[PDB]
Amino acid sequence: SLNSTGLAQAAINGLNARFYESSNARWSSDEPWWISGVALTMVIEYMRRSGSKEYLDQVEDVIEVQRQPLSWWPSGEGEFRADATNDTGWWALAMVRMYDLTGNEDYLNISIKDEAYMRQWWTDTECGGGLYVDIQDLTYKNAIANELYLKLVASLANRAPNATIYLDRAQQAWTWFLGSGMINGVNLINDGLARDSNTGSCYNNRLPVWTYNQGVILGALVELYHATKDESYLLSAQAIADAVLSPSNGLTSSSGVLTETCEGSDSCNQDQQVFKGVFALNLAELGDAVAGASSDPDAGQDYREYLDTNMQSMYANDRSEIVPTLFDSSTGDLYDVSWSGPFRNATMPKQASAIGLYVANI
Ligand SMILES: OC[C@H]1O[C@H](OC[C@H]2O[C@H](O)[C@@H](O)[C@@H](O)[C@@H]2O)[C@@H](O)[C@@H](O)[C@@H]1O
Numbered sequence: 001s002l003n004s005t006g007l008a009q010a011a012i013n014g015l016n017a018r019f020y021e022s023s024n025a026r027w028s029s030d031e032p033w034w035i036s037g038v039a040l041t042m043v044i045e046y047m048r049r050s051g052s053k054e055y056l057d058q059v060e061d062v063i064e065v066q067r068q069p070l071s072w073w074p075s076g077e078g079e080f081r082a083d084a085t086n087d088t089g090w091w092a093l094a095m096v097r098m099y100d101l102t103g104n105e106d107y108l109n110i111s112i113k114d115e116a117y118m119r120q121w122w123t124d125t126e127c128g129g130g131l132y133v134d135i136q137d138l139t140y141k142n143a144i145a146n147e148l149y150l151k152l153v154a155s156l157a158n159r160a161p162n163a164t165i166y167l168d169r170a171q172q173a174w175t176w177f178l179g180s181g182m183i184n185g186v187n188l189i190n191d192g193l194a195r196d197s198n199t200g201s202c203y204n205n206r207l208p209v210w211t212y213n214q215g216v217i218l219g220a221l222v223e224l225y226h227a228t229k230d231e232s233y234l235l236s237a238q239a240i241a242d243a244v245l246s247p248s249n250g251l252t253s254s255s256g257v258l259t260e261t262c263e264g265s266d267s268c269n270q271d272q273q274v275f276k277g278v279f280a281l282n283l284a285e286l287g288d289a290v291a292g293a294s295s296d297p298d299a300g301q302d303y304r305e306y307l308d309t310n311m312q313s314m315y316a317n318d319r320s321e322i323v324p325t326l327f328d329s330s331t332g333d334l335y336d337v338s339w340s341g342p343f344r345n346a347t348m349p350k351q352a353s354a355i356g357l358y359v360a361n362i
């Protein structure tokens, strides 16, 4: 009885009415810039799966302005090339989805510039591969910057000209990620790697298991499947997704609701508030690829049922509505960080995570 398309549009309206800045062509200048890129990916994804184009003009506005050289990183020379490789990766993947929606080669070209920019900080001399996240310091090869890069080259291997060098880079990047040790004994991905002070060897730093570090890798393995037709990539993604859905690992509550590790202590900062929706959208990409790769009608049913359970829970316990006025006739929905907990406030990262879950059910 739940229309995920209608609720996604209501959440996007709530996101715009409360957090969109027309004068800046950006959501919430007080919140991390990379989350505007995630929010743009959510809006673009809503339009792709629903067939709507209500926000196409707004998206183009954001793209044209945020494409300019960043005031805090002019050496990047615009095209979303920022001071952290993970910032560039989020916008690069948004530009891939923009190309998927419009077919405009201009957006694909941004994604190609972003790939070359990110590879500038891939080094085989530390950890045998992988790239750094802190461009200025080069002290952290974490999980998210390398999952974003892996998903980028894997997508370019399916859409860009000269896609062979991108397929070669994606297969080598996955080989490094697998052998890095960041995937642990229960098939979940820790935050990043640390380096031995004496030997220079790298090891899993045992930092928290974040939901979006279990999601972006699924989209990367799905794009690696499309380019190779090798179901081995899907099986590896399925093992990671299964670990997230298993209540023994703590990411799935006893009610079957996705729960970030910081929700219990109510310590989720601006970054962590958006992590859940990123995983949900990527899990929908896996479930779609799994269902199409087999003739079983029940293929991917566990992932679809999981997304539906979380949608209903957040529908009933995490929802609020903006108060309409005599002057502002705007309508929509607002959401907090916990998909099962109550509503205390609504911020842009929590709103963006909200849209991602609804779009994952479209
Ligand atoms: O919150 C957990 C993550 O925290 C850091 O990533 C977020 C921050 O780092 C990015 O380089 C920049 O975009 C910042 O603006 C952003 O706030 C990393 O430690 C990451 O590995 C963690 O998962």
Ligand SMILES: OC[C@H]1O[C@H](O)[C@@H](O)[C@@H](O)[C@@H]1O
Pocket: 029, 031, 032, 033, 034, 072, 083
């Ligand atoms: O304002 C500074 C600007 O650059 C920083 O590196 C990032 O945190 C951005 O999110 C922020 O908007």
